[PDB]
Amino acid sequence: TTALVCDNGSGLVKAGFAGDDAPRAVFPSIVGRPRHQGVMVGMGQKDSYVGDEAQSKRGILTLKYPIEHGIITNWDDMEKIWHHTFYNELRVAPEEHPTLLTEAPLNPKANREKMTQIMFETFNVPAMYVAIQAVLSLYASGRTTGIVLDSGDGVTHNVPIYEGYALPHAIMRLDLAGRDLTDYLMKILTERGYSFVTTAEREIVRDIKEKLCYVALDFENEMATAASSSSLEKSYELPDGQVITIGNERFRCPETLFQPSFIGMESAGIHETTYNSIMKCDIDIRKDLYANNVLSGGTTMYPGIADRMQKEITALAPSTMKIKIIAPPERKYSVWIGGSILASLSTFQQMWISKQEYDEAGPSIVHRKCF
Amino acid sequence: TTALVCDNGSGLVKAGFAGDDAPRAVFPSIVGRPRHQGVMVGMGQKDSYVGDEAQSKRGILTLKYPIEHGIITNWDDMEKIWHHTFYNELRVAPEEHPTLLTEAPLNPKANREKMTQIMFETFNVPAMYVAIQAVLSLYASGRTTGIVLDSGDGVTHNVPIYEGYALPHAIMRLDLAGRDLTDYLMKILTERGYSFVTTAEREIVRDIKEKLCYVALDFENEMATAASSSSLEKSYELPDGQVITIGNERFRCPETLFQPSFIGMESAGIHETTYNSIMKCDIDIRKDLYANNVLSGGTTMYPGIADRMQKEITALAPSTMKIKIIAPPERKYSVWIGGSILASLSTFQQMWISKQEYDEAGPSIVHRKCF
Amino acid sequence: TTALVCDNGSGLVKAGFAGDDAPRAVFPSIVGRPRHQGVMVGMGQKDSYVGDEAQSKRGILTLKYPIEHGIITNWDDMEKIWHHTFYNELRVAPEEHPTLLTEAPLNPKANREKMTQIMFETFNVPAMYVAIQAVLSLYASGRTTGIVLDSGDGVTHNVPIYEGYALPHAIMRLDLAGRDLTDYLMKILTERGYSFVTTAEREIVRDIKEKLCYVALDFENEMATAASSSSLEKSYELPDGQVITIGNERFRCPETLFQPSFIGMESAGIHETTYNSIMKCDIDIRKDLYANNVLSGGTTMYPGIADRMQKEITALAPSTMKIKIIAPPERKYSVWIGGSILASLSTFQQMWISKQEYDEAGPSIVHRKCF
Amino acid sequence: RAQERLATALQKLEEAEKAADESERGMKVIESRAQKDEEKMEIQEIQLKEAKHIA
Amino acid sequence: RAQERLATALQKLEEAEKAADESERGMKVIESRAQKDEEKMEIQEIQLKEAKHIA
Numbered sequence A, B, C: 001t002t003a004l005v006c007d008n009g010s011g012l013v014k015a016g017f018a019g020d021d022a023p024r025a026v027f028p029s030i031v032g033r034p035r036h037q038g039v040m041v042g043m044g045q046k047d048s049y050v051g052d053e054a055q056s057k058r059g060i061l062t063l064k065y066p067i068e069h070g071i072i073t074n075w076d077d078m079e080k081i082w083h084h085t086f087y088n089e090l091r092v093a094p095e096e097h098p099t100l101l102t103e104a105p106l107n108p109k110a111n112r113e114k115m116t117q118i119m120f121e122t123f124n125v126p127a128m129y130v131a132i133q134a135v136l137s138l139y140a141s142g143r144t145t146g147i148v149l150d151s152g153d154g155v156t157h158n159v160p161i162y163e164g165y166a167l168p169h170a171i172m173r174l175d176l177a178g179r180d181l182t183d184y185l186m187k188i189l190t191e192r193g194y195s196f197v198t199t200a201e202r203e204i205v206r207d208i209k210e211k212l213c214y215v216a217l218d219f220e221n222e223m224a225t226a227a228s229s230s231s232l233e234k235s236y237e238l239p240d241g242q243v244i245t246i247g248n249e250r251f252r253c254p255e256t257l258f259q260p261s262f263i264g265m266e267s268a269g270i271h272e273t274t275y276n277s278i279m280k281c282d283i284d285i286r287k288d289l290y291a292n293n294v295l296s297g298g299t300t301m302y303p304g305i306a307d308r309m310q311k312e313i314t315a316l317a318p319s320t321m322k323i324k325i326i327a328p329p330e331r332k333y334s335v336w337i338g339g340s341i342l343a344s345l346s347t348f349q350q351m352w353i354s355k356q357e358y359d360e361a362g363p364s365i366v367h368r369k370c371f
Numbered sequence D, E: 001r002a003q004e005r006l007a008t009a010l011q012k013l014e015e016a017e018k019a020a021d022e023s024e025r026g027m028k029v030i031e032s033r034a035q036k037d038e039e040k041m042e043i044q045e046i047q048l049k050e051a052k053h054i055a
């Protein structure tokens, strides 16, 4: 038997089989419902589109994300997402496959409890397990120490690990991510004349962000460069023509990661929460952590983010340390890759939570040594 | 010297002097041009009528608004509007008076820059300043905290302010207003046979709206009351005769503000964007914001809108807070009143943009700390 | 002439006159600065609020503490705190009043030296003196023998004293205190879905802790009873609503004092450092020290901490010894009471550091016999 | 055919611009590395002269 | 008009391959300069250690 590695994320579902080199199914975690009335009789419209289909019918739907910041807020939508993943994308029967699921640090406990209750009762999986995203990133990176910065789409977090032991008191979690960057980019494009308001235009703005945004190495110098030159402006082609041209908005959007006061948050940038997690860690492992700073997740994928973060952390740390930032090209899928590695490990086969254990001890079994 | 206060708005120009209790020139923001040929030689008729004269010559002209949603789209028309305001309604020389202009939040920047350029090059004013409409509304209301909902004719926006500090990340702007309500009323008045299609029958429909429409405290109960009785059905007399009778669409028109799906918009009602702005603010100013919910602008003048807003926000917010809605009788002119207060403040005489500052720094000087 | 008694501590300034039963000015030692834009001209707002004023405007300010763990890390902020205490809370001219200050054992020397340099050059007092907090606790307790546990807000320490002689080699200092308990409570509240991240929400969490937390007599049995029943659940009403329900983290928070491994510290609990200070002392005084175990400071104010510490120390010490724990109801102010007593003693008037002594010997006069 | 070759030339322009701007970013991070190198160099040469004189 | 924007696409392709060959030649010269810089910085780091040891 083989296991299923479903990294449900928050804004992208990634599923596949344990032992693969990459996820087989990657689609947005979206549930769309029609908002107009529907006149053609006989074509038999359905009531909810889930996944990559909702992006095709995007023009006549209201797109909902069932998961807000790591946390699941709509359990019916999430059951639809999982059903679509199991049956219409992987085409497997979950009654005969263990399932490894992934979660961010410092979430509510009812999240995991309801997740496993659903997986055992609605889908009847034989076993299941919930892993932390950062640990799986560090598996897939081929390290055993290092401070991992996993910037997804709802949540950003640092998890310092040394020699296979994690330092829980030094785990930092920040609720600024790609979704807030998209909202800031909408709000900041509005000052050039373009307005995107609907949930179906949020997707167009997310595409603009992915395709044109980058991190400036020096924010003030890039601002002056954009104010004087015009060599920074790119054009983008909306899905109906009418090209839009954006200038300093390209590097002004992901700069919110380093100055979260742009969106009215009080906290510190990612370069500073990384350093603060390191300084919470014990003094004997800080050199290794400085040398093994691992990036993963979709929001770490801007051009120039590694160079920017190295410049910042280097200016912060003592001048006699080797700051080094590991940013693989397959960053976005690191959590899934590590999950596949972990579920294929042979030592792991007695760490699943079986159906018998669940029927014995209730959903509370999730927080036990079978974590 | 004295400063002028020109509240351009979108659909009604309001001008006056700084230090008065009310504007002395309120006229529509329309520019009409004749559409027929013109036979009587010696008539010597003009080519474009501005303001209140166009409303007299409606039946002969095509009426155009130079401001769509806050944004100015026809700069020649807007320049005609300003010339009329300065020389024919107020009878002042604009090269001797500072001018305070107003604008809505989250507009393009070229709007404000071109406005400044016009006011300095064409009209040659000594100083000028562009202010936000919601802040001026809060000046006129006598508060210093509170979340203001300024529903004009182009745009609707919430701007939460606490102790004189505005929270820009919580500013909301919606493009539903009196113009969209007029269009919806034109559309649903065809269910009874009345047809208003001309650009000059829109003014008749706007008059019908102002004089007969009201907000229902409960929408289904008023729907049933209109379906059964006839006690809520009222009549109106056109400029031609032939009275029209308005039934349940007396309250279906302004209900679009609370159900923007009526006109096919995706967004949420004003009662819900207000609450979302609250919940986007901090946690320890929300009680004051709930208690100081300020209404202004012409689209808030419907009967029953304050009671409806209170019922809705009360059903939304927690059950332990006093929700209060401030709705003065001189709502429609609140922005202008606050503008006069501000421009008369002696502290303000150092916030003007002088002409020499402009001549040396270009029109970009508008977005500086005078923003 | 009268002396002032300013007990700074790390998070609550409390001052007054020598010869009173209580301080007349107790306020948090925070300095807030506005972090938002500021739109209302003529508001004339300030740039930094200190003390209790900054607590009313939390939703607008970013709150700093100028004292981290006993140690002062922001001298400008501390100078502001002292200026506020002298002129606005007390309304006295500090150039005509001797001032008694306190500090914790085993701090840097520059802390104390710079403190006296400020008090002589800036505030220009005629005399001053710095006292150890535990000694003043022992004065106020009415004893001359005993081991005093002074858990403040940044630092905890034991200081054994016998017949008025302090045994410096047995002094223990621990950097676990109320601030770390607040951070741990913020971290474990996220298990139920509440998130407090802002520096202004740290204060909400501190009030929650003060009002609801208590020390369990038996930690494992309390965990079992919280898992089984629901009689421990208590609700708290935030500044808005969404009343939060707190379960076993009512007593999991202050249990960090007895198990510092919860927050990833290596050291041992307060009961064990107390016992270790005892066994570090001589053998002829351990009986009196067991019988005179004095608690003081705000973190010793949890319900049940005296009974818990007696149970632990009794299990540690030999069976033939009677353990006693003195916990007055005015523990939070014991250091100030003792400071007032000491400064009013007529014998003490020869122990002040006069201004001429300072002028002739430099700030080094503070570690000298003029202690 | 004209539209086909238009689109192909466009996508090739896109690829070339990607490569060129990435090279620009690389050369900028390299020259910054070089100035940081040079300032570390001056500091370490100065401590070298200090160590040699004191030795 | 197809031939018009076609000719502009082709001239853009010419200058774009110009920018691309400049990118590649520049990155070659700058990677050579880089490797030189790291040779220099490592030899001077070892020399700094030697100097502190003699000190």
Ligand SMILES: Nc1ncnc2c1ncn2[C@@H]1O[C@H](COP(=O)(O)OP(=O)(O)O)[C@@H](O)[C@H]1O
Pocket (backbone or CB within 6 Å): A008, A009, A010, A011, A012, A013, A151, A152, A153, A154, A178, A179, A206, A209, A210, A211, A297, A298, A299, A301, A302, A303, A332
């Ligand atoms: N090339 C890119 N540049 C910038 N952002 C990107 C890029 N690719 C994806 N993203 C962002 O990453 C987010 C998705 O991150 P992801 O790794 O899928 O997290 P999750 O799996 O939890 O949704 C999206 O919101 C998207 O905006």
Ligand SMILES: Nc1ncnc2c1ncn2[C@@H]1O[C@H](COP(=O)(O)OP(=O)(O)O)[C@@H](O)[C@H]1O
Pocket (backbone or CB within 6 Å): B008, B009, B010, B011, B012, B013, B151, B152, B153, B154, B178, B179, B206, B209, B210, B211, B213, B297, B298, B299, B301, B302, B332
């Ligand atoms: N009593 C009323 N009831 C309903 N709507 C009104 C009333 N009075 C004015 N309005 C609407 O208000 C709009 C004008 O609002 P106003 O405050 O003038 O905004 P602006 O100045 O930006 O045009 C008009 O479109 C009109 O339809």
Ligand SMILES: Nc1ncnc2c1ncn2[C@@H]1O[C@H](COP(=O)(O)OP(=O)(O)O)[C@@H](O)[C@H]1O
Pocket (backbone or CB within 6 Å): C007, C008, C009, C010, C011, C012, C013, C151, C152, C153, C154, C178, C179, C206, C209, C210, C211, C297, C298, C299, C301, C302, C332
């Ligand atoms: N009733 C209480 N229960 C628990 N903790 C308390 C109580 N009252 C105060 N505290 C804690 O005590 C701390 C303040 O202690 P305090 O005596 O002011 O020390 P310092 O003066 O050195 O700051 C605060 O952090 C608060 O959390």
